[PDB]
Design an enzyme around this catalytic site. Sequence first.
Site, PDB file in Angstrom:
ATOM      1  N   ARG A 270       5.860  -4.226  -0.979  1.00 57.45           N
ATOM      2  CA  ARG A 270       4.113  -3.353  -1.125  1.00 57.45           C
ATOM      3  C   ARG A 270       3.927  -2.648  -0.516  1.00 57.45           C
ATOM      4  O   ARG A 270       4.509  -1.376  -0.288  1.00 57.45           O
ATOM      5  CB  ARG A 270       3.608  -4.305   0.708  1.00 57.45           C
ATOM      6  CG  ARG A 270       3.713  -5.963   0.723  1.00 57.45           C
ATOM      7  CD  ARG A 270       3.315  -6.596   0.100  1.00 57.45           C
ATOM      8  NE  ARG A 270       2.774  -8.196  -0.290  1.00 57.45           N
ATOM      9  CZ  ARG A 270       3.854  -9.559  -0.079  1.00 57.45           C
ATOM     10  NH1 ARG A 270       4.657  -7.976  -0.761  1.00 57.45           N
ATOM     11  NH2 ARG A 270       3.671 -10.846   0.186  1.00 57.45           N
TER      12      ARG A 270
ATOM     13  N   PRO B  36      10.148  -4.660   1.625  1.00 59.41           N
ATOM     14  CA  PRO B  36      10.444  -3.259   2.116  1.00 59.41           C
ATOM     15  C   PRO B  36       8.715  -3.094   1.685  1.00 59.41           C
ATOM     16  O   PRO B  36       7.651  -3.228   0.438  1.00 59.41           O
ATOM     17  CB  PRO B  36      11.020  -3.028   1.279  1.00 59.41           C
ATOM     18  CG  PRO B  36      11.448  -3.496   0.411  1.00 59.41           C
ATOM     19  CD  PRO B  36      11.718  -4.820   0.955  1.00 59.41           C
ATOM     20  N   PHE B  37       7.973  -1.991   2.143  1.00 53.57           N
ATOM     21  CA  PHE B  37       6.526  -1.193   1.713  1.00 53.57           C
ATOM     22  C   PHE B  37       6.283   0.005   2.340  1.00 53.57           C
ATOM     23  O   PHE B  37       7.335   0.848   2.869  1.00 53.57           O
ATOM     24  CB  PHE B  37       5.902  -1.856   3.704  1.00 53.57           C
ATOM     25  CG  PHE B  37       5.520  -3.251   3.966  1.00 53.57           C
ATOM     26  CD1 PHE B  37       6.244  -3.855   3.179  1.00 53.57           C
ATOM     27  CD2 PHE B  37       4.882  -3.551   4.976  1.00 53.57           C
ATOM     28  CE1 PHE B  37       5.554  -5.716   4.084  1.00 53.57           C
ATOM     29  CE2 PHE B  37       5.199  -5.395   5.531  1.00 53.57           C
ATOM     30  CZ  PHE B  37       5.679  -5.842   4.532  1.00 53.57           C
TER      31      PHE B  37
END
Lengths: 64, 64, 64, 64, 64, 64
Positions: free
Chosen positions: E39, E1-2
């Site tokens: 990130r 997941p960003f």
Amino acid sequence: PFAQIYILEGRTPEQKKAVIEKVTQALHEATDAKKETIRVWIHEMPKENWGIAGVSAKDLGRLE
Amino acid sequence: PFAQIYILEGRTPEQKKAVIEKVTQALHEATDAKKETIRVWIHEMPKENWGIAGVSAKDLGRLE
Amino acid sequence: PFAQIYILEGRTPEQKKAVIEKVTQALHEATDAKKETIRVWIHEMPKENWGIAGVSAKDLGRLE
Amino acid sequence: PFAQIYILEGRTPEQKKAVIEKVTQALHEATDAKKETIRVWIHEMPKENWGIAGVSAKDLGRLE
Amino acid sequence: PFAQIYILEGRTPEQKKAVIEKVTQALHEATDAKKETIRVWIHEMPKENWGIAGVSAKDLGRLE
Amino acid sequence: PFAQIYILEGRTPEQKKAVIEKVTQALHEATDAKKETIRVWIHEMPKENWGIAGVSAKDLGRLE
């Protein structure tokens, strides 16, 4: 290095896999970043949601 | 097709031109879109502004 | 409704204020959303970081 | 100049066409960019996917 | 997941490190994703480039 | 402060609500911004549309 790709709806799954593969290779070669670090994701936009010079891809698709 | 690229600060101008060139070619080949339609732009992120697993690129750059 | 705007570097502050004002008004009129809810922010991209058909805005600016 | 628009799901197609038209006109007038260069695309976000002060648009829609 | 974070210019480096740390932890706890995969990056927006209800953060900062 | 979150498709609605809640709290604590100002929205990406080191999440999901 990350790439956020915007394409219109309606492309084949082979084309989308190629986007991921070729863009990843492009970033690897341009920056020498390890492929492990590279991320590419794809937003598929409805033709009604994509404006070119004020006209949607949908209205354009009606024309020649 | 559009590509929004995120890279860390500190890359050469030659590498950034190559990002534009190779990503554009990658999208042309993957989707067969006319190059005239392809757009690629690059955000250069400060190392303090780039988190990997909760640690910034800056703190990582201090290490081996 | 939110608008994320991408422009090249080099525009006047008056033009950027107008972007915020006119885009906000455009979203208010198109969706009838309360202006209180509307947000517009602007990324200014270096000309070296902006690719059109594989060529950067910088290289194009050298030409007529 | 490019505009990336984020709206909630549930708006009419007329409103989305108006977003494309009015935002494009807004950018043309604010920057004097040729309309040929202007691009506007729209992400439609599910109400469950849209947080305002920690509460989703969906939970808010249940209220008055 | 960003997570792509947008903040105004002018925050301390400690606050930006905390953004990276706390948002990463938030995504880890909400999704159970391994921290290795998470990130988070931060765009710092000039106050002239940030519109709230049609008024820029800069013009607002002049007021009480 | 705004957070744009990218996750793969397939997460529970409870996890998505937690993303909104915990990321909002994370930004509140890291920046001391009023919760009223914080916005978090979530893009759910198809596994075919999410590249890690040149390989899509879909092809990876086939493996152990």
